[model samples]
Target: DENKLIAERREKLKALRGQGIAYPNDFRREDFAGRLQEEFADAETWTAEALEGNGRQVKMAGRLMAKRIMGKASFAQIQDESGRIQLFLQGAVLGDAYTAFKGWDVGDIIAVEGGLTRTKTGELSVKAESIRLLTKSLRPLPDDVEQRYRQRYVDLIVTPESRAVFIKRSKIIRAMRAWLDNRDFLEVETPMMHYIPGGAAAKPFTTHHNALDLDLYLRVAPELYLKRLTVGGLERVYEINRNFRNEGVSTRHNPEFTMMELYEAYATYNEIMDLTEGVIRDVAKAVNGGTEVEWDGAKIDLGPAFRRWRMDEAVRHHNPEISAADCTDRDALLRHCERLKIRVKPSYGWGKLLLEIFEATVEHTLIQPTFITDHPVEVSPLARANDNDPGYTDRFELFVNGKELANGFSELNDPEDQAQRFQAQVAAKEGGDDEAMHYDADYIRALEYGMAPTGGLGIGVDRLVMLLTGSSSIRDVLLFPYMRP
Candidate 1:
């Protein structure tokens, strides 16, 4: 059936070529379908006589989405980026031109030069003087789920809601950029290829260079390079770019994703927390018109100061059976994990065990914006250790609607402590933990040159857009989410 349909469309394309170029860009659309509807918004009624006397002609173009062809005249719908507009046609006025238009199909890109008027059905419509076939579609687009992402252009034309999600996605990033720019942050770009993957504890995708005979990995984060800039005298910097991770894909995780990484010299993790909360509330108000949104069947209010709750408190609140003293006992935490049907690695220490318990029991219960602070030092390799609590770090992860939206910390600048942490990470990797940080001698050298006390944050831009747009799946927000070949 697909073959038959394609064959018929191709035949139409063959006929279309005889008239003019099948793909022509000469026709210019001076107006948008949405603007045409808006310019005449107060039109209570429009008779044909009124339009004839007014003579307000406009040129517009869009994909021919729907058509109703009678012997004399036709009613059709044309869709542009702004919105859709109705088209009215008559065989007597257009003559041979109208006869030619009859052969055109639904998917063709078309231009209509006409005066604005209202049809008898009380809909604002375009009365066409002439119509031109701008481009021909050789195949019809389908509404299959797999095919929608595979052929996003087709989906964008057919699905308005899909188009809207991406539009807001763009605005969300723009709003973030504006927010940082207003705050005196310099937007910078960092290297995409790195010899050492030291930023985060994630497996990297590697590639080899033939000329240099060097092995390189796609960057998992821009953290180290951006920090180096701070040491080089750029006091404030930010990057909104793509990061690659050799990890599994899910509704919330993408192998290739976007992050907005920022650094502020002479600032603490506590300051970054306040800045992050302000950024979210500011961006939400700019994009969605207020600091509240409905996402995943939950109403989230972004107006208040995000709640600052410690990891220990959250764990106990969710798993009420566990006591404070039991959190530090590895055997007791492992037993608690088992009781909750959550699995933990046998070699996992108390910190890892506590993390597993919190993730399984508490993370999804946080429906509003909340800052989960004071992460275990074992899990926070890059965060500065807390001055008072040596077992924990000055780190905070902002959570909204059950998932982490942003991660920030007071950066660990001491070269000796950083080296020790990296050594431990190397030991972990050797002990069969594939997702462990690697020792970066160059980064340590940068630290030895004396980096400033900085507060740094990395925000998941795609996930933020998903929250603002009320999108359930990350794929719903991405224009072309990865799919299986």
Candidate 2:
């Protein structure tokens, strides 16, 4: 964000390069984190007094997080992809390497070939024989980039909290994969580019394939493709992928982000309710080592027993005396909204009108985990209808800390029924809902070929990571979420 910082870094680089050496990568590591501790456990148990080494040379490369270059001896905190480690460069140990260190910039990438040692401060450090550039940082980092975690490489150097957040982010996903994999769900990859985007309620980012003479859109959700795998005989399939959406950006939204969407054949939404709880608890345990965590000054207990409520019920929970019974028909609801001075889009249907009210009045107030089920039919394009009540669909969205975290439903398998929903969504698009989905004939056709009464779920990986990592904003979990600059 600051242009002055970039210019200053450029000037510093130019002056340093004038002395002959610029960028060099002549170094190797005997061990990374492995040798540092026997994987940290051994390093923790083994005291600094235990001095024993093979004397094999190692090259460690990382960004300089902190520096205290004393007259003859210097110490700096260097961080790499794994974690941070302290480095001690002495006039005798580093010798000529100390001279090269004089030209080093804080953000520049450097590698030091050294022996393992502990300093007088009782910190683990690399005693270097030689030091040289692994890469030259050409620009200054944006202010607060580390704190916001907009840039991971820079964040590793500047913010210790950023490091912990990302560490938890990886642990969360790892726990999820383990949990799902243990359940026999095969991890799969689907096409990221699609002919017609057909998942979720978001707009797709349109793009053109220059050589193919075709117009392709980045997949807004991997739902349809993952379902095709289900139709093709893969009973349980899941994909954790990047989905691109041309939509609004907020603490809750990003143009492109990671999602973990899964589908299991012959499972009902009720069955998925339990599965969802277990998976979330596992991830929570992996990150926090317990079911409860403090988020935004509130305690979020992601324990197994998450309360479930219907969408209409949830809306009413937040605002009493508001019910689907009172808002009988579209005309009645329109009048009610008008009386309350609640703004409603003229082109919106009854379900859209209700969704608007729920988002505005209900979502932000829920600080605990809740599964809101039985959503109105008008908004559920791919969900099965409630058998006894055709007015609602067999869909459920899990909300935690008042933010929507996961969405799924008992999938609609009938081709004729799916066709009507697609047509309805297309109608909505024509009627001014730009975020309405485009009809995917192939996905509908795949359903016609007999999709097993499937239960599908999609969880925002970023949002989940944010919760478990105690990151308040979506940017904190992402390594390079979009920035204005």
Candidate 3:
């Protein structure tokens, strides 16, 4: 049936080509369907006879969505970007144009000049005086979910909800930028291809430059370069850009995703936490008209302060068998891992083991807005060590709907300490940890120049969109998600 419809449309296109200017671009539209609907919303003032008396002529263009023909007259629906409007055509007025319109398919792009009036059913409609075919649509829109991702252009044309989700996504990013810009934060663009992917702990997609004969990796995160700008005295800076990672594809994971990363000089992790809360709430209110959102069948309230729990406390709270002291004890953590049937590596330290346990036991249970803080130093090589506790880093990962939305911390700025941590990371890489960070000497040199006390943040833009749009899958929120061909 789909193939038959497509073939029939092709035949129609062939016939149209025999006529002059089959795909005419000469039509000039002076109005939109939605604006007209809103402008004449007062039915008492804009009655059918009143509209004819007013004699307001308007030109509009859109894709034909619906058609109902009855002998000499017809009522059709056309959809512009703004919205859909009903168009009424009479053979007595339009003559041959009405005859040509009877053969036009639903998906054909068209333009019409008409007078506004209300139908017998009290629906606002355009009485088209002139009509012309703009473009012939060859293929019918697909309704399959998988095809929607593969052919997003068709999805955008046929699915209003999908279109609205993307529009809201744009508004969310704009709101975030406005929030930061108001607070004296300068937006910057960093390199997407890096000689060393040093920002986050993730494998990078390697690419080759032909002329330079150099192997460069797509950036896992824009952290190091953005911080270099901070070292150059760009006090408050933010970047809303793409980050590429070679990772497994899942409902929540993508090879290339967007992030909003920022650095604020003379700020601590505590200040960053406050900024994170403020940014999320402000964006929620801006896009959603409130600080509360419904996501994945759960109500998430961004109006209240998010709960802050230390890593050890959260781990102990979730797993009552584990004591607070056992969080740092290698043997105890390893034994707990054994009991939980969680896999371990020979090189896994107590910090890594504790984190694995926490992830397996507690991460998904955090449905409400919560900040899991005080991550172990081993897992947070780029974050500053806690002043009160040398073993833990001053870091937090915000979780909502059981997914990590944002990660932030006071940045590790001491050159010597950074160098040592990089060496340790190098050792871990040698010990078969493919996701470990590489030793970045240039970054250490930047730190050697004396960076001010700075706090940094990375928010998963895709995840945030998912949260606000109530999208269950990352693929649904993304315009063109990766698919296995």
Candidate 4:
């Protein structure tokens, strides 16, 4: 049936080509469907008779959505970006044009010139004086959800909800930029391809440069370069851009995603936490019109301050059987992991084991906005160590609706400490851990030149969009999510 319809549309296109110009580009629209609907919303003033008296002409272009042909008259619906409006056609008013209109199909791009009026049913409509087919759609829009994602153009033409999500996504990012720009943060772009992917703990997608004969990895995060900018006296800086990770796909994870990363000099993790709250709340209010959003059937109030908990405290709260002391006890943690059937590598230390336990037992239980702070130093290579506790880093991961939305910490700036951490990561990579960082000597050199006490943050923009838009999957919020071919 689809093939037959497509072939018929092709024939129509061929017949149109036989005419002067199949795809005419001379049509100029002076009005939009939605704006007209709004301007003449009051029926008392914009009645059919009053509209005829006013004689206000409107020129518009849109995709034909619906058509109903009666004996001598017809009513059709056309959709522009703003909204849809009805068109009333008459055989006497449009002689041969009416005959051509009868042959026009839904999904055809068209232009119309008409005067505004109201139908007998009191619905606003355009009494079209002229009409022309601008582009004939060769194929019908798909109905499957997967096909909608694969062919977003068709989805945009048919699904208002999908179009709305993307529009809101843009608004959300714009709000974020506005919020940061108001706070004296300079937006900057960093290198997407890196010689050493040192920013985040993830495998990078590698590419080769032919002329240079050098291998480069797509950045897992823009942390290092952004911080280098800060070191160069760009006190407050932010980057809203793409990050690539060669990883598995899931409801929460995508191979390529967007992040909003920033750095502020002379700020600690505590200050960054306050900034994070301000940014999220402000963006929520801007895009959603409130700081409360519903996601996955749970109401999240982003209005108030988010709760903060130490990582070990959260682990103990979720696992009542484990004592506070046992949180740091390697033997006790290993024993619990064995009982819980959690797998661990031979090289896994107490910190790694503790994190694994937290993921398995505590992460999903955090339904409300909460910051899990004081992550183990082993898991936070680029974050500064807690001033009083060398074993834990002063890092925080913001969790909302059981997903990590943002991560920030006091950056590790001591050259010696960063060098040691990089060495440890290299060792881990050599020991069969592929998602480990490489030793970036240039970054070390930058730190050696001295960096101020700085705090850094990275927010998963896709996950943030998912939260704001009530989208369940990362793919739902992304414009072009990776698909297995």
Which prediction has more favorable TM-score, 1 or 3? 3
lDDT of 3 by residue, 385-439 (tens): 9888889999999999899999999999999999999999999999888899999
Q: Can you give the TM-score per candidate against the true fold?
A: 0.96, 0.84, 0.98, 0.98
lDDT of 4 by residue, 298-360 (tens): 899998789999889999888898998898888999999998999988888889999999999
Among these predictions, the greatest lDDT belongs to 3
Off by over 4 Å in 2: 1-22, 33-120, 125-152, 249-252, 346-350
lDDT of each: 0.89, 0.78, 0.91, 0.91
In candidate 2, the residue pairs with backbone N, CA or C atoms under 3 Å apart (3 or more residues apart, or in different chains) clash, namely 28-59, 29-59, 366-402
With a 3 Å backbone cut-off (N, CA, C), the pairs that clash in candidate 3 are none
Stretches > 4 Å off in candidate 4: 249-252
Q: Is candidate 2 or candidate 4 better by TM-score?
A: 4
Q: Candidate 3, residue 361: CA error in Å?
A: 1.1
Q: Looking at model 1, which ten-residue stretch has the lowest summed lDDT?
A: 40-49
Sort all candidates by TM-score, best to worst. Answer: 4, 3, 1, 2
Model 2 TM-score on a 0 to 1 scale: 0.84
Q: In candidate 4, where is summed lDDT lowest over 10 consecutive residues?
A: 140-149
